[PDB]
Design an enzyme around this catalytic site. Structure first.
Site, PDB file in Angstrom:
ATOM      1  N   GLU A 128       0.749  -1.260   0.000  1.00  0.00           N
ATOM      2  CA  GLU A 128       0.000   0.000   0.000  1.00  0.00           C
ATOM      3  C   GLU A 128       0.781   1.314   0.000  1.00  0.00           C
ATOM      4  O   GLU A 128       0.578   2.150   0.881  1.00  0.00           O
ATOM      5  CB  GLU A 128      -0.951  -0.013   1.204  1.00  0.00           C
ATOM      6  CG  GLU A 128      -1.815  -1.260   1.254  1.00  0.00           C
ATOM      7  CD  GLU A 128      -2.596  -1.410   2.547  1.00  0.00           C
ATOM      8  OE1 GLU A 128      -2.474  -0.553   3.448  1.00  0.00           O
ATOM      9  OE2 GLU A 128      -3.337  -2.405   2.662  1.00  0.00           O
ATOM     10  N   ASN A 170       2.129  -5.105  -3.408  1.00  0.00           N
ATOM     11  CA  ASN A 170       0.730  -5.379  -3.066  1.00  0.00           C
ATOM     12  C   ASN A 170      -0.037  -4.095  -2.702  1.00  0.00           C
ATOM     13  O   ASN A 170       0.506  -3.212  -2.041  1.00  0.00           O
ATOM     14  CB  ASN A 170       0.726  -6.366  -1.885  1.00  0.00           C
ATOM     15  CG  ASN A 170      -0.621  -7.008  -1.640  1.00  0.00           C
ATOM     16  OD1 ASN A 170      -1.207  -7.622  -2.533  1.00  0.00           O
ATOM     17  ND2 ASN A 170      -1.113  -6.892  -0.409  1.00  0.00           N
ATOM     18  N   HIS A 207     -10.290  -6.228  -2.318  1.00  0.00           N
ATOM     19  CA  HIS A 207     -11.266  -6.085  -1.246  1.00  0.00           C
ATOM     20  C   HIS A 207     -12.414  -5.328  -1.909  1.00  0.00           C
ATOM     21  O   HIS A 207     -12.380  -4.104  -2.025  1.00  0.00           O
ATOM     22  CB  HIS A 207     -10.683  -5.278  -0.084  1.00  0.00           C
ATOM     23  CG  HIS A 207      -9.682  -6.040   0.727  1.00  0.00           C
ATOM     24  ND1 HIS A 207     -10.023  -7.151   1.469  1.00  0.00           N
ATOM     25  CD2 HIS A 207      -8.352  -5.861   0.908  1.00  0.00           C
ATOM     26  CE1 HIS A 207      -8.944  -7.622   2.071  1.00  0.00           C
ATOM     27  NE2 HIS A 207      -7.918  -6.857   1.747  1.00  0.00           N
ATOM     28  N   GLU A 236      -5.923 -10.777  -1.418  1.00  0.00           N
ATOM     29  CA  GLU A 236      -6.739 -10.684  -0.206  1.00  0.00           C
ATOM     30  C   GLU A 236      -8.221 -10.573  -0.539  1.00  0.00           C
ATOM     31  O   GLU A 236      -8.961  -9.790   0.061  1.00  0.00           O
ATOM     32  CB  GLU A 236      -6.287  -9.462   0.597  1.00  0.00           C
ATOM     33  CG  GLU A 236      -4.777  -9.430   0.850  1.00  0.00           C
ATOM     34  CD  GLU A 236      -4.336  -8.205   1.631  1.00  0.00           C
ATOM     35  OE1 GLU A 236      -5.201  -7.562   2.253  1.00  0.00           O
ATOM     36  OE2 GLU A 236      -3.126  -7.895   1.633  1.00  0.00           O
ATOM     37  N   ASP A 238     -12.094 -10.689  -0.900  1.00  0.00           N
ATOM     38  CA  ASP A 238     -13.303 -10.799  -0.088  1.00  0.00           C
ATOM     39  C   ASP A 238     -14.274  -9.837  -0.748  1.00  0.00           C
ATOM     40  O   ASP A 238     -13.879  -8.777  -1.248  1.00  0.00           O
ATOM     41  CB  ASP A 238     -13.106 -10.531   1.429  1.00  0.00           C
ATOM     42  CG  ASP A 238     -12.366  -9.250   1.748  1.00  0.00           C
ATOM     43  OD1 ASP A 238     -12.526  -8.242   1.033  1.00  0.00           O
ATOM     44  OD2 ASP A 238     -11.638  -9.256   2.766  1.00  0.00           O
TER      45      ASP A 238
HETATM   46  O1  LIG Z   1      -9.373  -6.686  14.137  1.00  0.00           O
HETATM   47  C1  LIG Z   1      -9.173  -8.038  14.519  1.00  0.00           C
HETATM   48  C2  LIG Z   1      -8.262  -8.756  13.537  1.00  0.00           C
HETATM   49  O2  LIG Z   1      -8.869  -8.706  12.251  1.00  0.00           O
HETATM   50  C3  LIG Z   1      -7.952  -9.544  11.540  1.00  0.00           C
HETATM   51  O3  LIG Z   1      -6.637  -8.945  11.509  1.00  0.00           O
HETATM   52  C4  LIG Z   1      -6.526  -7.741  10.729  1.00  0.00           C
HETATM   53  C5  LIG Z   1      -6.012  -8.150   9.347  1.00  0.00           C
HETATM   54  O4  LIG Z   1      -6.982  -8.965   8.698  1.00  0.00           O
HETATM   55  C6  LIG Z   1      -5.770  -6.907   8.506  1.00  0.00           C
HETATM   56  O5  LIG Z   1      -5.266  -7.275   7.267  1.00  0.00           O
HETATM   57  C7  LIG Z   1      -5.021  -6.194   6.355  1.00  0.00           C
HETATM   58  C8  LIG Z   1      -6.320  -5.846   5.623  1.00  0.00           C
HETATM   59  O6  LIG Z   1      -6.083  -4.775   4.687  1.00  0.00           O
HETATM   60  C9  LIG Z   1      -5.103  -5.119   3.697  1.00  0.00           C
HETATM   61  O7  LIG Z   1      -4.958  -4.032   2.860  1.00  0.00           O
HETATM   62  C10 LIG Z   1      -3.759  -5.446   4.368  1.00  0.00           C
HETATM   63  O8  LIG Z   1      -2.798  -5.806   3.381  1.00  0.00           O
HETATM   64  C11 LIG Z   1      -3.971  -6.612   5.331  1.00  0.00           C
HETATM   65  O9  LIG Z   1      -2.753  -6.927   5.988  1.00  0.00           O
HETATM   66  O10 LIG Z   1      -4.809  -6.055   9.150  1.00  0.00           O
HETATM   67  C12 LIG Z   1      -5.258  -5.611  10.448  1.00  0.00           C
HETATM   68  C13 LIG Z   1      -5.485  -6.815  11.364  1.00  0.00           C
HETATM   69  O11 LIG Z   1      -5.960  -6.335  12.640  1.00  0.00           O
HETATM   70  C14 LIG Z   1      -5.039  -6.349  13.676  1.00  0.00           C
HETATM   71  O12 LIG Z   1      -4.650  -7.712  13.915  1.00  0.00           O
HETATM   72  C15 LIG Z   1      -3.671  -7.830  14.973  1.00  0.00           C
HETATM   73  C16 LIG Z   1      -4.245  -7.274  16.280  1.00  0.00           C
HETATM   74  O13 LIG Z   1      -3.275  -7.375  17.315  1.00  0.00           O
HETATM   75  C17 LIG Z   1      -4.625  -5.809  16.063  1.00  0.00           C
HETATM   76  O14 LIG Z   1      -5.170  -5.261  17.253  1.00  0.00           O
HETATM   77  C18 LIG Z   1      -5.660  -5.748  14.941  1.00  0.00           C
HETATM   78  O15 LIG Z   1      -6.032  -4.398  14.698  1.00  0.00           O
HETATM   79  C19 LIG Z   1      -7.973 -10.827  12.375  1.00  0.00           C
HETATM   80  O16 LIG Z   1      -9.049 -11.652  11.947  1.00  0.00           O
HETATM   81  C20 LIG Z   1      -8.220 -10.263  13.805  1.00  0.00           C
HETATM   82  O17 LIG Z   1      -7.126 -10.599  14.647  1.00  0.00           O
HETATM   83  O1  LIG Z   2      -7.238  -1.016   4.834  1.00  0.00           O
HETATM   84  C1  LIG Z   2      -7.809  -0.799   3.552  1.00  0.00           C
HETATM   85  C2  LIG Z   2      -9.036   0.104   3.671  1.00  0.00           C
HETATM   86  O2  LIG Z   2      -8.665   1.358   4.222  1.00  0.00           O
HETATM   87  C3  LIG Z   2      -9.624   0.306   2.271  1.00  0.00           C
HETATM   88  O3  LIG Z   2     -10.750   1.111   2.333  1.00  0.00           O
HETATM   89  C4  LIG Z   2     -11.382   1.411   1.072  1.00  0.00           C
HETATM   90  C5  LIG Z   2     -11.348   2.922   0.824  1.00  0.00           C
HETATM   91  O4  LIG Z   2     -11.990   3.229  -0.436  1.00  0.00           O
HETATM   92  C6  LIG Z   2     -13.367   2.813  -0.465  1.00  0.00           C
HETATM   93  O5  LIG Z   2     -13.892   3.155  -1.701  1.00  0.00           O
HETATM   94  C7  LIG Z   2     -13.463   1.296  -0.255  1.00  0.00           C
HETATM   95  O6  LIG Z   2     -14.825   0.895  -0.268  1.00  0.00           O
HETATM   96  C8  LIG Z   2     -12.834   0.944   1.092  1.00  0.00           C
HETATM   97  O7  LIG Z   2     -12.887  -0.461   1.293  1.00  0.00           O
HETATM   98  O8  LIG Z   2     -10.000  -0.964   1.704  1.00  0.00           O
HETATM   99  C9  LIG Z   2      -8.872  -1.862   1.570  1.00  0.00           C
HETATM  100  C10 LIG Z   2      -8.250  -2.128   2.944  1.00  0.00           C
HETATM  101  O9  LIG Z   2      -7.128  -2.984   2.802  1.00  0.00           O
END
Ligand SMILES: OC[C@@H]1O[C@@H](O[C@@H]2[C@@H](O)[C@H](O[C@@H]3CO[C@@H](O)[C@H](O)[C@H]3O)OC[C@H]2O[C@@H]2OC[C@@H](O)[C@H](O)[C@H]2O)[C@H](O)[C@H]1O
Ligand SMILES: O[C@@H]1[C@@H](O)[C@H](O[C@@H]2CO[C@@H](O)[C@H](O)[C@H]2O)OC[C@H]1O
Ligand SMILES: OC[C@@H]1O[C@@H](O[C@@H]2[C@@H](O)[C@H](O[C@@H]3CO[C@@H](O)[C@H](O)[C@H]3O)OC[C@H]2O[C@@H]2OC[C@@H](O)[C@H](O)[C@H]2O)[C@H](O)[C@H]1O
Ligand SMILES: OC[C@@H]1O[C@@H](O[C@@H]2[C@@H](O)[C@H](O[C@@H]3CO[C@@H](O)[C@H](O)[C@H]3O)OC[C@H]2O[C@@H]2OC[C@@H](O)[C@H](O)[C@H]2O)[C@H](O)[C@H]1O
Ligand SMILES: O[C@@H]1[C@@H](O)[C@H](O[C@@H]2CO[C@@H](O[C@@H]3CO[C@@H](O)[C@H](O)[C@H]3O)[C@H](O)[C@H]2O)OC[C@H]1O
Ligand SMILES: O[C@@H]1[C@@H](O)[C@H](O[C@@H]2CO[C@@H](O)[C@H](O)[C@H]2O)OC[C@H]1O
Ligand SMILES: O[C@@H]1[C@@H](O)[C@H](O[C@@H]2CO[C@@H](O)[C@H](O)[C@H]2O)OC[C@H]1O
Ligand SMILES: O[C@@H]1[C@@H](O)[C@H](O)OC[C@H]1O
Lengths: 436, 436
Positions: A128, A170, A207, A236, A238
């Site tokens: 990012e 990525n 996403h 990633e 979803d």
């Molecule tokens: O909030 C609970 C946490 O949700 C999940 O962990 C998330 C990750 O999924 C998330 O992934 C990013 C999503 O956006 C993408 O662009 C990026 O490349 C991904 O890496 O990142 C944040 C993470 O949350 C943290 O997880 C560790 C924890 O200690 C922190 O407090 C959270 O904020 C998991 O399902 C759950 O643990």
């Molecule tokens: O962490 C990232 C989010 O901040 C990101 O948020 C997007 C911002 O633009 C909007 O138009 C999208 O709907 C919203 O999801 O999404 C990707 C995530 O990795």
């Protein structure tokens, strides 16, 4: 046709992976699904910067290795995520800027890749780095403030640390070709390849949601990047709402691009998702396969000879030749369905929605009030319960999402009036249906 | 007098109540809704046998009084629930039997009713005394084993304890007139009335789901009991899926019966429900009004000057005189909607589902890409999100469930091509729509 996502993807030389959370590995329901369906693993958080280097110079791989060990023990390859990123930086790194931050970034890349040298298929070296402001420029972070060349340096560093790994850039919101962000990333990768900067792949987080929806031009985005001489990967994935059609579309886009290495969905069950509220994954909380799961599997397996009946359509059982029919065109909730001589009538016109419902009359849904054998299949106002969701298997059977049981014509009945119930699937002719 | 459920019901001399749990009275989100919307309260658990007489001979009204006081202090009448029941009996009473149990039953009634003497509108003297086996007979419990006359004795006891209270017999699955259970209760109440057994009301719990669905004959049941000379009350209403039509149907059934005192829904928010999985109430966990809430409110206020459309219809803006239109009949997710000269075409035909969706093309949904002012309104694959659910207010405005904001023609535009967004409701002509 293969029966699991990984095996089906492998039929085209690709993989199908998921994001694994080490804290959920002690959950049998979680691991049963994850080990069975995926052949590629990304640590959801365990290989990030704060997790791997808690203190400057002090590397910690306890969390990351638990994920890695599980993956290899279960025959999956691994995507390392992620080496340089503005987010989830440990406190000591957040306090850094300029040359000191630059060297710390380099040291981090060397330390982590060195530990996993030769064991990682792909590394999201940089994550990012572009802004969402529409300018198509770089995101303002401490890393970017060290100099615009920070990304290039990270990739050159990674290449030397582990030349066996594919190095990926990525990002998210870079799927729709028309977006400035997408094009800013394209130009950078183009510049890199042009000047010999070490980059092997571009990861499209994918996403998707109504804020940033999937667009069919995603295939052209993938083709454009592939043309630069890099592989591409959906990293990633979803989808808010988990539309079967959208999940299938994304799958077919990857399968249409030879350089698309595979697809990774960001999590196993909706309840494990970082965005559970959007029920964006392929399995629901109780571990049952969602309508989208079947759509993806069918897509990976090449799809169907003939496209699904767009709107309306009768459901005829092969073993009877009759169509699923609502007794006397009744619209009363609780009315158990039956088999009857097919004919042009709304009480026999069912619509399979992207959510996995079998609608009739427009707002009534094929419904099951139970999960055990013998449960009567009826109609009830549509509301989205899993007992109103079904999967259209390639073998012609229709399975209830919640119950996991197949639509069954009581006692192999083939005559008119034969009621419909739920029962353990058996490949019987009274459990097969044609979308004629 | 018509902006809230209680006030609207009051217009016809009825009430609209809920079930209160004292443990939630400290939650401002909970009480803000409860104090505003209902004018009748039932203690969800605090007035039951175990909660009021923990140990034999030792009454404790701490919890019960907390609910009662909140109710009266906030202008709500109270339904006492429940004096004699086979379920939730304290441990000591469960092991009792014979004449020992009978005397205890009487002592309990006298103790509880005596405490609340003259302060309770209705009392569920006896709860669920009939079986579901389909025989129409009594439920086998320690209470029934003390003599088939326990019910009668309970009512005679209640009358003496507090003659000012209306004595009700409460039960579930007695809404469908064709069921044996319903007949068993009907015959008993008829007999009681003929023999002079002091019974003033019959409470129909109304816990509807696809297992025991609502049927239009519920009105007939209510009218049949009313004809016996007893008042009727819908006491614990909740509907699996919270269908707007089913909720309005039940509301209209009560309004159609002069003896129907009012309606009580079993809880405030879905998260407060004993069956949250069925999202059966009128408010969401975040406190937002659901599609069904507006359907109920509109029914209580006397419905609309014209019968609600039957799916497939145009939505015309009052200020512009133009119709909600999907640009060029596109079906791609993310396509923002607009205003356009009305004409017969599927891209202008919207269907309001019982779940509160506005569907087009059959499986596309009016979708809000966010929750703040200026949020784009577009079409997106239907999946059931609250950002795809809408409320059809009586004043012609259409409010998004999740955002609480109104469909709005951008900048008050009225010309073809004017885009649609979300914006604070203002009663403006650019936020008013007619489906007729
Ligand atoms: O909030 C609970 C946490 O949700 C999940 O962990 C998330 C990750 O999924 C998330 O992934 C990013 C999503 O956006 C993408 O662009 C990026 O490349 C991904 O890496 O990142 C944040 C993470 O949350 C943290 O997880 C560790 C924890 O200690 C922190 O407090 C959270 O904020 C998991 O399902 C759950 O643990
Ligand atoms: O962490 C990232 C989010 O901040 C990101 O948020 C997007 C911002 O633009 C909007 O138009 C999208 O709907 C919203 O999801 O999404 C990707 C995530 O990795
Ligand atoms: O802890 C869950 C509990 O669920 C809710 O409380 C429920 C009541 O709503 C329920 O009401 C009856 C529903 O069936 C009707 O026929 C009957 O007339 C109603 O009274 O009764 C059971 C009760 O559950 C108990 O609540 C107390 C708790 O200590 C027990 O363990 C539960 O079994 C509330 O939302 C929530 O507290
Ligand atoms: O007429 C000029 C036009 O109206 C004004 O903007 C209005 C707001 O004043 C209005 O405020 C709400 C009034 O009702 C209250 O109950 C509520 O709490 C207030 O928030 O909300 C609507 C807004 O109109 C929109 O403005 C943006 C535009 O794109 C939309 O089309 C309008 O409907 C300003 O003077 C100007 O907007
Ligand atoms: O998405 C928009 C289309 O829906 C739009 O369709 C045109 C709508 O108007 C049609 O003509 C009307 C017929 O009925 C008369 O009463 C009206 O006065 C006429 O305007 C026309 O035939 C449709 O093509 O076109 C624009 C798209 O953006
Ligand atoms: O009540 C009986 C049903 O339970 C019975 O169900 C059959 C069980 O075996 C399966 O192979 C059949 O498909 C299924 O219909 O059918 C007869 C009925 O009387
Ligand atoms: O406590 C009571 C429940 O036991 C009762 O359960 C019903 C049994 O019959 C089924 O057909 C219904 O779907 C199911 O709800 O419901 C009422 C409740 O008070
Ligand atoms: O539902 C059936 C209807 O479709 C047919 O036309 O007549 C017999 C009914 O039972």
């Amino acid at each position: 046709a293969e029966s699991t996502l990984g095996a089906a993807a492998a039929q085209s030389g690709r993989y199908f992976g998921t994001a694994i959370a080490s804290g959920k590995l002690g959950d049998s329901a979680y691991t049963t699904i994850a080990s069975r369906e995926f052949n590629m693993v990304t640590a959801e958080n365990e290989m990030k910067i704060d997790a791997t280097e808690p203190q400057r110079g002090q590397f910690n791989f306890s969390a990351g290795d638990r994920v890695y060990n599980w993956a290899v023990q279960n025959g999956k390859q691994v995507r390392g995520h992620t080496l340089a990123w503005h987010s989830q930086q440990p406190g000591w790194m957040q306090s850094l800027s300029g040359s000191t931050l630059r060297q710390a970034m380099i040291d981090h890349i060397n330390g982590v890749m060195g530990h996993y040298k030769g064991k990682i298929a792909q590394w999201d070296v940089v994550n990012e780095a572009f802004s969402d402001d529409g300018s198509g420029g770089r995101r303002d972070s401490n890393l970017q403030r060290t100099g615009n060349d920070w990304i290039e340096v990270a990739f050159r560093t990674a290449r030397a640390a582990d030349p066996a790994a594919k190095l990926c850039y990525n990002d998210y919101n870079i799927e729709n070709w028309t977006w400035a962000k997408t094009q800013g990333v394209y130009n950078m990768v183009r510049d890199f390849k042009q000047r010999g900067v070490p980059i092997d792949c571009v990861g499209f987080q994918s996403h998707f949601n109504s804020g940033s929806p999937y667009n069919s031009n995603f295939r052209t985005t993938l083709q454009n990047f592939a043309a630069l001489g890099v592989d591409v990967a959906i990293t990633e994935l979803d989808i808010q709402g988990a539309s079967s059609s959208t999940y299938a579309a994304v799958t077919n886009d990857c399968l249409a691009v030879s350089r698309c290495l595979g697809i990774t969905v960001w999590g196993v069950r909706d309840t494990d998702s970082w965005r559970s509220g959007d029920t964006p994954l392929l399995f629901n909380g109780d571990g049952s396969k969602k309508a989208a799961y079947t759509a993806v599997l069918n897509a990976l397996n090449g799809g169907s000879s003939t496209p699904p009946p767009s709107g309306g359509g009768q459901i005829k059982g092969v073993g009877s030749g009759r169509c699923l029919d609502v007794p006397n065109a009744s619209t009363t909730d609780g009315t158990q369905v039956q088999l009857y001589d097919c004919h042009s009538a709304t009480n026999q016109q069912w619509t399979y929605t992207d959510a996995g419902e079998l609608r009739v009359y427009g707002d009534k849904c094929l419904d099951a009030a139970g999960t055990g054998n013998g449960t009567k299949v009826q109609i009830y106002s549509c509301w989205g319960g899993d007992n109103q969701k079904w999967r259209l298997n390639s073998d012609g059977s229709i399975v209830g999402v919640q119950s996991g049981l197949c639509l069954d014509a009581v006692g192999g009945g083939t005559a008119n009036g034969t009621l419909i119930q739920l029962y353990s699937c058996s490949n019987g002719s009274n459990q097969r249906w044609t979308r004629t």
